[PDB]
Design a protein around this nucleic acid. Structure first.
Ligand SMILES: NC[C@@H]1O[C@H](O[C@H]2[C@@H](O)[C@H](O[C@@H]3[C@@H](O)[C@H](N)C[C@H](N)[C@H]3O[C@H]3O[C@H](CO)[C@@H](O)[C@H](O)[C@H]3N)O[C@@H]2CO)[C@H](N)[C@@H](O)[C@@H]1O
Ligand SMILES: NC[C@@H]1O[C@H](O[C@H]2[C@@H](O)[C@H](O[C@@H]3[C@@H](O)[C@H](N)C[C@H](N)[C@H]3O[C@H]3O[C@H](CO)[C@@H](O)[C@H](O)[C@H]3N)O[C@@H]2CO)[C@H](N)[C@@H](O)[C@@H]1O
Ligand SMILES: [K+]
Ligand SMILES: [K+]
Ligand SMILES: [K+]
Ligand SMILES: [K+]
Ligand SMILES: [K+]
Ligand SMILES: [K+]
Ligand SMILES: [K+]
Ligand SMILES: [K+]
Ligand SMILES: [K+]
Ligand SMILES: [K+]
Ligand SMILES: [K+]
Ligand SMILES: [K+]
Ligand SMILES: [K+]
Ligand SMILES: [Mg+2]
Ligand SMILES: [Mg+2]
Ligand SMILES: [Mg+2]
Ligand SMILES: [Mg+2]
Ligand SMILES: [Mg+2]
Ligand SMILES: [Mg+2]
Ligand SMILES: [Mg+2]
Ligand SMILES: [Mg+2]
Ligand SMILES: [Mg+2]
Ligand SMILES: [Mg+2]
Ligand SMILES: [Mg+2]
Ligand SMILES: [Mg+2]
Ligand SMILES: [Mg+2]
Ligand SMILES: [Mg+2]
Ligand SMILES: [Mg+2]
Ligand SMILES: [Mg+2]
Ligand SMILES: [Mg+2]
Ligand SMILES: [Mg+2]
Ligand SMILES: [Mg+2]
Ligand SMILES: [Mg+2]
Ligand SMILES: [Mg+2]
Ligand SMILES: [Mg+2]
Ligand SMILES: [Mg+2]
Ligand SMILES: [Mg+2]
Ligand SMILES: [Mg+2]
Ligand SMILES: [Mg+2]
Ligand SMILES: [Mg+2]
Ligand SMILES: [Mg+2]
Ligand SMILES: [Mg+2]
Ligand SMILES: [Mg+2]
Ligand SMILES: [Mg+2]
Ligand SMILES: [Mg+2]
Ligand SMILES: [Mg+2]
Ligand SMILES: [Mg+2]
Ligand SMILES: [Mg+2]
Ligand SMILES: [Mg+2]
Ligand SMILES: [Mg+2]
Ligand SMILES: [Mg+2]
Ligand SMILES: [Mg+2]
Ligand SMILES: [Mg+2]
Ligand SMILES: [Mg+2]
Ligand SMILES: [Mg+2]
Ligand SMILES: [Mg+2]
Ligand SMILES: [Mg+2]
Ligand SMILES: [Mg+2]
Ligand SMILES: [Mg+2]
Ligand SMILES: [Mg+2]
Ligand SMILES: [Mg+2]
Ligand SMILES: [Mg+2]
Ligand SMILES: [Mg+2]
Ligand SMILES: [Mg+2]
Ligand SMILES: [Mg+2]
Ligand SMILES: [Mg+2]
Ligand SMILES: [Mg+2]
Ligand SMILES: [Mg+2]
Ligand SMILES: [Mg+2]
Ligand SMILES: [Mg+2]
Ligand SMILES: [Mg+2]
Ligand SMILES: [Mg+2]
Ligand SMILES: [Mg+2]
Ligand SMILES: [Mg+2]
Ligand SMILES: [Mg+2]
Ligand SMILES: [Mg+2]
Ligand SMILES: [Mg+2]
Ligand SMILES: [Mg+2]
Ligand SMILES: [Mg+2]
Ligand SMILES: [Mg+2]
Ligand SMILES: [Mg+2]
Ligand SMILES: [Mg+2]
Ligand SMILES: [Mg+2]
Ligand SMILES: [Mg+2]
Ligand SMILES: [Mg+2]
Ligand SMILES: [Mg+2]
Ligand SMILES: [Mg+2]
Ligand SMILES: [Mg+2]
Ligand SMILES: [Mg+2]
Ligand SMILES: [Mg+2]
Ligand SMILES: [Mg+2]
Ligand SMILES: [Mg+2]
Ligand SMILES: [Mg+2]
Ligand SMILES: [Zn+2]
Lengths: 235, 150, 208, 138
RNA sequence: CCUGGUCCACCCGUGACGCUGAGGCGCGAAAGCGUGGGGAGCAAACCGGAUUAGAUACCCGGGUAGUCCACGCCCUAAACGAUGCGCGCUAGGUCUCUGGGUCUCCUGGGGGCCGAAGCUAACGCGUUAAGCGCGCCGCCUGGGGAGUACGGCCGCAAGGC
RNA sequence: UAGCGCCGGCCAACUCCGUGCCAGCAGCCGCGGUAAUACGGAGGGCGCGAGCGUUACCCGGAUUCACUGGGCGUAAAGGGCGUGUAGGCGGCCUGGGGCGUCCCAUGUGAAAGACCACGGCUCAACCGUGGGGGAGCGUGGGAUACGCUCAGGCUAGACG
């Protein structure tokens, strides 16, 4: 719960083009053909955002951490593993929210097959099944890994790039689910309920923001877990 | 609790090699006559499934109607596609004066007396949608002054 | 006109028990009791979901056949009530209930409405002491509907009024049985009438 | 040039609000100013003020909207849903005092120009004067 | 050589002198007409050779009007963005022609593309609007009969309105 | 005294027989070529009833000549293009007049009819009495925001 001048790399935005005019309020100026995020407005929105987050956290709500960006993959996979929160890592399957029942059936089949590879019954029936069901588990664990933690619709979602993840965003809107996001200059601010106007590219910004966020979560529910071990993923 | 009436059932057709293939659309309105309505269009291989599904959708999508003594607070024109609906408030005892479609929708919203007209395209689907939209746009003096506080 | 045909058949077509017969519609002979399905060859077959128009038509026909009035008189009354101040439905019902024949029936001088119409046409009824033979005569509040002094010795009126001893009369009517006279106190509210009729459907039927 | 300055202002305001502009400038005139007063009083705009764009006078109309909404399309409710010009150059609409309309059964307004000045429907009806029917806003 | 339109920079001059535009007047592709000239290539008509069941066509060899020039007529068209003119307003991105500037870029005029809001029956349009508005002109009112008949005007005629 | 029309959908009311793209029906969509709820008859039903149907004509629905209240990229519809006459339309500020516009008062707007109430024919139809209206135009008085006009000024349109 500090930040301030400790933000390094965030104020860097996307290029001159590729931007969204609706984002103009959050820009300071254009340096070297690069929109630079407004220094103060970032913290301005940060307060309200993290306040919402703390409230939601201590109330017992769940947050779905979402990004595909491959910059944000290896971060989210742990940062969401910290606390209790579910995440979407590999890709966002259309209907995970709106079709959520049907998608949950796949989770039931997942723990179904994990249960199959538990019992003696792995060897029962020909290798035809043993080669298949193993790959079924393979992909089910590849996609639904962080999604398995959702027993019911989430009370909010967290998004790294809201333009990239804009489907998740869209049906979160559709279900009246509060949308938290880290927005860059290419993104529509209007769709985001609680905005974090920063660089969604560099691993530094993602690490900083999500780590601080989960820190706030566990801080709200108490226990004060140690500093996030995603810091070695700077690579 | 929830009263529901279908508007039009229709049978459509696609064309596959060696034949026509029939599907069924159903327009169902649901409402409590307490001022809450809903409208849905279900589509299924057979009529009952389409009707039931339509009911499901109509209960999904709802509209809160601000009734004043059984009638509407103020007049609205609404254009949905080429269809146009004109709703106008009326004194008690008038009864609902409307075509089949908006009659059903209004009656299930708990409207006693109203005056309407269908203009442009009369196509029942778009008229229904137009009506729902009209109801969705109505405001009360309360809401109005809620907006203009400043 | 005024019909003149099988009545309990209409009990059956309208699907509700109407009393056009006076007594025996109370007795379990009404045939609406023993054959509640509609009249004719196809009466017992499954009915198809009626059109909106069908429902309105049938409701208005119900309301009309209850009072045994021709469609012309009926229409005239409705339009008259429509031009009038006040709610059209209630005023319609009020105007229907103001008919002399209906009042005679209500007061229990007659067991059925048709019998009452005969009683009016044959001069057994007086209004304020003057004889009135028109069943369509509109009664006004304050009017005393009595029986003809010369008709008071008639067997039918004996039977009917002897039955009326102990029976209560509608709130807008008063009845003196001994003198065989009654007073029309006011016009009935919608609340007063027990009619198995949605009037708004009839309003909707002429609304077309 | 502009054929109808007032219709133009109304349109400027419409176009400005549909994109949710913070404010909008319109070329200044006393009449426009008089209209804007009514607008502000009736609560359709946050307010207006005289400014100078280049060396020429303008009116900044600060617009007004509802709260952010839920579901898809968070875009707030317009305070001005409908603003429409009635009397135009080339067809001019004058009403008597009994001919003064009632907008959305009172939920809207209509701006009249009268000899007693620029008034609303309620205002003129109360003052007992008719006039030129400038527009309807609700 | 003669001559029309237009764009930018300066902020100099006049002080609403503006917009549209029924009639009128002028222009108006190709074909076609009149007079005179010209005539290489092409080429309606036409003359042949093929093909075909036939082939008054497609293919091949010829060929006249015409195409070309001058002057005078004709007034048509898928004369098309199938989108009247003028002005104001409403995100941007990108390519390009042409000015100006503190010349990565900014700013102005034109031609393209994708797209905000919005519009549209959809297709699509979207600061080059088919969006939001005002002014003024032209036009529409089911299909065939029929752009015919009649009348009038115009034209040498063909024929046009 | 009880009759007349209808029962494929629009549109309230269905079965048997005869007929076999015939005879015929039909307002529109349509029905009839062997098992017709659509022709013809019968039973039955629906609707009106001293009437019920048909034809013609008028308004309606028809926002289908769109003032209220429509359109013209591809559905009918932008003139082949310009120049410009009459006409229509007109940026910002001040002042005068008060033609348009608005307000008050007053005259007129016959009766019958229309509306409302009470009343006479036993009811009603028919009729009597009373009340309430009212656009338009005339006269007198008043207001001046907008449009008009005259007088002055400005430079954001236009022109140089
Ligand atoms: N021409 C008769 C006049 O009737 C006047 O009275 C008029 C109205 O009061 C009366 O209206 C009648 C009445 O029963 C009551 N007030 C309401 C009722 N709905 C109407 O009944 C009838 O009115 C007319 C024919 O009279 C028709 O429209 C129709 O037959 C019927 N509606 O109808 C009369 C018009 O004919 C006055 N007595 C007087 O001017 C004069 O006698
Ligand atoms: N398609 C007609 C076009 O009309 C234009 O001008 C037209 C429109 O700009 C103008 O606006 C009209 C309005 O007057 C009339 N009262 C109603 C009509 N719906 C409006 O139309 C306008 O608004 C609607 C949305 O409401 C849009 O869908 C439509 O595109 C737009 N033209 O009315 C004009 C008459 O139609 C051009 N002058 C003409 O060249 C062009 O052909
Ligand atoms: K619209
Ligand atoms: K809807
Ligand atoms: K020739
Ligand atoms: K053309
Ligand atoms: K340069
Ligand atoms: K679309
Ligand atoms: K295409
Ligand atoms: K295209
Ligand atoms: K025969
Ligand atoms: K057959
Ligand atoms: K038959
Ligand atoms: K007609
Ligand atoms: K021409
Ligand atoms: Mg509401
Ligand atoms: Mg439309
Ligand atoms: Mg009301
Ligand atoms: Mg139509
Ligand atoms: Mg009435
Ligand atoms: Mg009434
Ligand atoms: Mg009517
Ligand atoms: Mg108007
Ligand atoms: Mg007047
Ligand atoms: Mg009213
Ligand atoms: Mg009130
Ligand atoms: Mg100067
Ligand atoms: Mg000067
Ligand atoms: Mg011009
Ligand atoms: Mg011209
Ligand atoms: Mg030419
Ligand atoms: Mg030529
Ligand atoms: Mg020649
Ligand atoms: Mg020659
Ligand atoms: Mg050759
Ligand atoms: Mg040859
Ligand atoms: Mg051949
Ligand atoms: Mg040969
Ligand atoms: Mg040749
Ligand atoms: Mg020659
Ligand atoms: Mg010409
Ligand atoms: Mg072209
Ligand atoms: Mg072009
Ligand atoms: Mg173009
Ligand atoms: Mg061009
Ligand atoms: Mg052009
Ligand atoms: Mg066309
Ligand atoms: Mg254009
Ligand atoms: Mg033009
Ligand atoms: Mg010009
Ligand atoms: Mg131009
Ligand atoms: Mg450009
Ligand atoms: Mg070009
Ligand atoms: Mg595009
Ligand atoms: Mg869109
Ligand atoms: Mg599309
Ligand atoms: Mg434009
Ligand atoms: Mg034409
Ligand atoms: Mg023409
Ligand atoms: Mg014709
Ligand atoms: Mg033609
Ligand atoms: Mg021709
Ligand atoms: Mg001729
Ligand atoms: Mg000649
Ligand atoms: Mg010839
Ligand atoms: Mg010829
Ligand atoms: Mg039927
Ligand atoms: Mg027949
Ligand atoms: Mg046979
Ligand atoms: Mg048969
Ligand atoms: Mg039959
Ligand atoms: Mg038939
Ligand atoms: Mg029969
Ligand atoms: Mg009679
Ligand atoms: Mg007609
Ligand atoms: Mg009607
Ligand atoms: Mg009309
Ligand atoms: Mg109409
Ligand atoms: Mg017509
Ligand atoms: Mg119009
Ligand atoms: Mg049209
Ligand atoms: Mg075509
Ligand atoms: Mg053109
Ligand atoms: Mg033409
Ligand atoms: Mg002016
Ligand atoms: Mg002038
Ligand atoms: Mg005057
Ligand atoms: Mg009179
Ligand atoms: Mg009387
Ligand atoms: Mg008067
Ligand atoms: Mg005067
Ligand atoms: Mg003055
Ligand atoms: Mg003045
Ligand atoms: Mg001047
Ligand atoms: Mg210049
Ligand atoms: Zn009975």
């Amino acid at each position: 719960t500090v930040k301030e001048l400790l933000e390094a790399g965030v104020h860097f935005g996307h290029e001159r083009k590729r931007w969204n005019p609706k984002f103009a309020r959050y820009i300071y100026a254009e340096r070297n053909g690069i929109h630079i995020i407004d220094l103060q407005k970032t913290m301005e929105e940060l307060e309200r955002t993290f306040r919402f987050i703390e409230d939601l956290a201590m109330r017992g709500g769940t947050i779905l951490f979402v990004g595909t960006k491959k910059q944000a993959q290896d971060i989210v996979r742990m940062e969401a593993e910290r606390a209790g929160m579910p995440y979407v890592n590999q890709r966002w399957l259309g209907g995970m929210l709106t079709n959520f029942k049907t998608i949950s059936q796949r989770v039931h089949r997942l723990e179904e097959l994990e249960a199959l590879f538990a019992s003696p019954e792995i060897e029962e029936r020909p290798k035809k099944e043993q080669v298949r069901l193993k790959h079924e588990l393979e992909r089910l664990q590849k996609y639904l890994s962080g999604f398995r933690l959702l027993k019911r619709l989430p009370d909010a979602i967290f998004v790294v790039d809201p333009t990239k993840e804009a489907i998740a965003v869209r049906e979160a809107r559709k279900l009246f689910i509060p949308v938290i996001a880290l927005a860059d200059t290419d993104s529509d601010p209007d769709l985001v309920d609680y905005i974090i106007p920063g660089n969604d590219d560099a691993i530094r910004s993602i690490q900083l923001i999500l780590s601080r966020a989960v820190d706030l979560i566990i801080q709200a529910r108490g226990g004060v877990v140690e500093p996030s071990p995603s810091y070695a993923l700077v690579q | 609790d929830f009263e529901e009436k279908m508007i039009l059932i229709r049978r459509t057709a696609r064309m596959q090699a060696g034949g026509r293939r029939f599907r069924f659309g159903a327009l169902v309105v649901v409402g409590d006559r307490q001022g809450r309505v809903g409208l849905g269009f279900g589509k299924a291989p057979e009529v009952p499934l389409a009707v039931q599904k339509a009911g499901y959708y109509a209960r999904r999508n709802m509209v809160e109607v601000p009734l004043q003594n059984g009638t509407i607070p103020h007049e609205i024109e609404v254009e949905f596609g080429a269809s146009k609906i004109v709703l106008k408030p009326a004194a008690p005892g008038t009864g609902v004066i409307a075509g089949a479609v908006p009659r059903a929708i209004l009656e299930l919203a708990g409207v006693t007396d109203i005056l309407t007209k269908e203009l442009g395209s009369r196509n029942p689907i778009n008229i229904a949608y137009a009506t729902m939209e009209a109801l969705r746009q109505l405001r009360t003096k309360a809401d109005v002054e809620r907006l203009r506080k400043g | 006109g005024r019909y003149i045909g099988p009545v309990c058949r209409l009990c059956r077509r309208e699907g509700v028990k109407l009393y056009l017969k006076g007594e025996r519609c109370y007795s379990p002979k009404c045939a609406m009791e023993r054959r509640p399905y509609p009249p004719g060859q196809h009466g017992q077959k499954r009915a198809r979901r009626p059109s909106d128009y069908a429902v309105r038509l049938r409701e208005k026909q119900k309301l009309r056949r209850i009072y045994g009035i021709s469609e012309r008189q009926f229409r005239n009354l409705f339009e008259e009530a429509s031009k009038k101040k006040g709610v059209t439905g209630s005023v319609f019902l009020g105007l229907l209930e103001s008919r002399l024949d209906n009042v005679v029936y209500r007061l229990g001088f007659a067991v059925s409405r048709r019998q009452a119409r005969q009683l009016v046409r044959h001069g057994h009824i007086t209004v304020n002491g003057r004889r009135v033979d028109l069943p369509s005569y509109r009664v006004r509040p304050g009017d005393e509907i009595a029986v003809a002094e010369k008709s008071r010795n008639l067997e039918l009126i004996r039977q009917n009024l002897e039955a009326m001893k102990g029976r209560k009369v509608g709130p807008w009517l008063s009845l003196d049985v001994e003198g065989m006279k009654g007073k029309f106190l006011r016009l009935p509210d919608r609340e007063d009438l027990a009619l198995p009729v949605n009037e708004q459907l009839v309003i909707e039927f002429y609304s077309r | 040039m502009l054929t109808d300055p007032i219709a133009d202002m109304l349109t400027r305001i419409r176009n400005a609000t549909r994109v949710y502009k913070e404010s909008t400038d319109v070329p200044a005139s006393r009449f426009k100013e008089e209209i804007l007063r009514i607008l502000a009083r009736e609560g359709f705009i946050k307010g207006y003020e005289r400014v100078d764009v280049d060396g020429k006078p303008y009116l900044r109309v600060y617009l007004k909207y509802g709260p952010r909404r839920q579901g898809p399309d968070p875009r707030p409710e317009q305070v001005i849903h409908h603003i429409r010009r009635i009397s135009k150059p080339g067809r001019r609409v004058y009403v008597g005092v009994k001919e003064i309309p009632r907008v959305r059964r009172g939920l809207g307004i209509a701006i009249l120009s009268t000899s007693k000045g620029v008034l609303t429907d309620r205002e003129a009806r109360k003052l007992g004067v008719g006039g030129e029917l400038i527009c309807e806003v609700w």
